RNA sequence: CCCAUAUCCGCAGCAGGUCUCCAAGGUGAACAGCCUCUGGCAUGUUGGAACAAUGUAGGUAAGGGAAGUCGGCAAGCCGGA
RNA sequence: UCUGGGUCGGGGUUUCGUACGUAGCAGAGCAGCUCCCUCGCUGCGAUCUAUUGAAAGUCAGCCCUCGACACAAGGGUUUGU
């Protein structure tokens, strides 16, 4: 088995990530992350692994006003991978899913970094390259 | 004895670290002023013209990082002065501050 | 602990250095430092840059 | 010595260490003794006078 | 002063088990210490002198 | 004789106020801003030594990008041709 | 004190990125000299190449010196069961 280390997380509340599978959605507004209890006045925010909900902000008309569950599966922040290796991405991005993990879509365009490989098994196989 | 003459090199560079800008070039002088009150022994040092115009040549915020100088203790002839020597501080043109030690000068 | 070469400057990583880059085309770079990245970002050819290793065989100077 | 009885499987680990960096910390260093980075670099100016 | 190592993990069950980590660590110098006196306590209602 | 960051009014050698004449070189569209020459001055009623908090004035900042706040206030962006 | 610690110097480290001079049948081209040349040889010319991982900095709160040069039992004020 094995649970997931914290990275640094660097991606709050209100952050536009884009999304990366044919879905027809382009964006991820994201509105929170699952998991965080928080404290006053600190936001919400996620790494690579952490389900999050969020919503489209252009795309297809059927997508744009509702909630999703997404997962975040590249981010620009640099994280340490704990083999003393620090890794970034040149840009923030996610897959839109449920609440159990499957994808809405079927394709992921993009690496997908190996720390939500591992947590979400539909997500990595998926995944043309495992950054 | 008494009178005596040395060249030295004095690392400005590192008196005048982390001083503010409007006061390098003033700071350097009262450096070069304190150097020479612990090396010969005596107060009452004064500073040759054309020693303090090479240490402003470069303005007030960029002075040399290093300045050859020839001090000379004196016998204070000119007056019954308390200060039995004083200390002249001329200055000695150099290209080059490689491979450089205090030397002893002759007359 | 494998050791790694720096991508722009050709150098040798060793394991609590530097910062690895995936660009989202599938292409993994590992930079030595921050001169090395920035070099990298901004474009520019490690062969006209005069203290990388590609440079120094280009003109043969070892 | 610890005031405490040590009995969790972290604090029990048998450890083998693997590598210890040398790299200078005056800066970024690149090389991790002496023969190595001279032994890369090449004869440099300063050596050969 | 400070540096870094590299070791293997034997932690069971765990994502770093039989895996190489990078662990951040302390020297401290430790020369032999010269033992030059006995000083005996006693036990008292007022705490130990 | 002064004609004004000291000769005038403002209780004062008071950052305020108070009508005009002459007007160099470079850059540039330009009596713009910046740097210099003629002429003028000694930093504006004290120096010295330090580089703590808090300020006041100025800067920069990973990754997000108004989520702050009554309100994008402040700053930033934009800029010429 | 088996001295000592200072000031320079040297070495190590590291930062930036290859100094000035000089050389080049390297150079977009242009101007010249014609008994020349048998397609020359003087110039102007951003840039390039060699000398050159050079040059410059580096404890001031980096490291190691034993090279040089000086200086260090000197002062001042108080303290008794
Ligand atoms: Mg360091
Ligand atoms: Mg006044
Ligand atoms: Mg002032
Ligand atoms: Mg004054
Ligand atoms: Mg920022
Ligand atoms: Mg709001
Ligand atoms: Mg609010
Ligand atoms: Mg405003």
Same mark, same amino acid.
């Given at each position: 088995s094995g649970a997931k280390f914290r990275i640094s #997380?660097? #991606?709050?509340?209100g952050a536009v990530i884009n999304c990366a599978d044919n879905?027809?959605? %382009?964006n991820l507004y994201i509105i929170s992350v699952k998991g965080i209890k928080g404290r006053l006045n600190r936001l919400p925010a996620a790494g690579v692994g952490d389900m999050v909900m969020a919503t489209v902000k252009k795309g297809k008309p059927e997508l744009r006003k509702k909630v999703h569950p997404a997962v975040v599966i590249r981010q620009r922040k640099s994280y340490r991978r704990k083999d003393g290796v620090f890794l970034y991405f040149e840009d923030n991005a996610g897959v839109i899913v449920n609440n159990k993990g499957?994808? %809405?879509?079927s394709a992921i365009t993009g690496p997908v970094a190996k720390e939500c490989a591992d947590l979400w098994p539909r997500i990595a196989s998926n995944a043309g390259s495992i950054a | 004895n008494e009178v005596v003459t040395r060249e030295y090199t004095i690392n400005i560079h590192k008196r005048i670290h982390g001083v503010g800008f409007k006061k390098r070039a003033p700071r350097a002088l009262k450096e070069i002023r304190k150097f020479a009150m612990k090396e010969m022994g005596t107060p009452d040092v004064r500073i040759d013209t054309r020693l303090n115009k090479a240490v402003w040549a470069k303005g007030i915020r960029n002075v040399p990082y290093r300045i050859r100088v020839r001090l000379s203790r004196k016998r !204070?002839?000119?007056?019954?002065?308390? !200060?039995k020597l004083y200390t002249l501080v001329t200055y000695v043109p150099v290209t080059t501050f490689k491979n450089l030690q205090t030397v002893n000068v002759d007359e | 602990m494998k050791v790694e070469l720096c991508s722009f400057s050709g150098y040798k990583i060793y394991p609590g250095h530097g910062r690895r880059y995936a660009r989202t085309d599938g292409k993994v770079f590992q930079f030595l430092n921050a001169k090395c990245e920035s070099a990298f970002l901004s474009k520019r050819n490690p062969r006209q840059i005069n203290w990388t290793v590609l440079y120094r065989r280009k003109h043969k100077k070892g | 010595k610890s005031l405490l009885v040590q009995t969790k499987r972290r604090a029990l680990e048998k450890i083998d260490l693997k590598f210890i960096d040398t790299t200078?910390?005056?800066?970024?260093?690149?090389?991790?003794?002496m023969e190595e980075k001279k032994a890369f670099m090449g004869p440099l100016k300063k050596d050969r006078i | 002063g400070m540096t870094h190592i590299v070791r293997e993990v034997?932690?069971?069950?765990? +994502?770093?088990? +039989?895996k190489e980590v990078v662990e951040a660590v302390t020297i401290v110098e430790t020369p032999p210490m010269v033992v030059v006196g006995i000083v005996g306590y006693v036990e008292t209602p007022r705490g130990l002198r």
């Open positions: #997380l660097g #991606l709050p509340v879905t027809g959605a %382009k499957e994808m %809405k879509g | !204070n002839e000119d007056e019954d002065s308390p !200060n | - | 200078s910390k005056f800066g970024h260093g690149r090389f991790q003794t | 034997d932690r069971p069950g765990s +994502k770093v088990n +039989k």
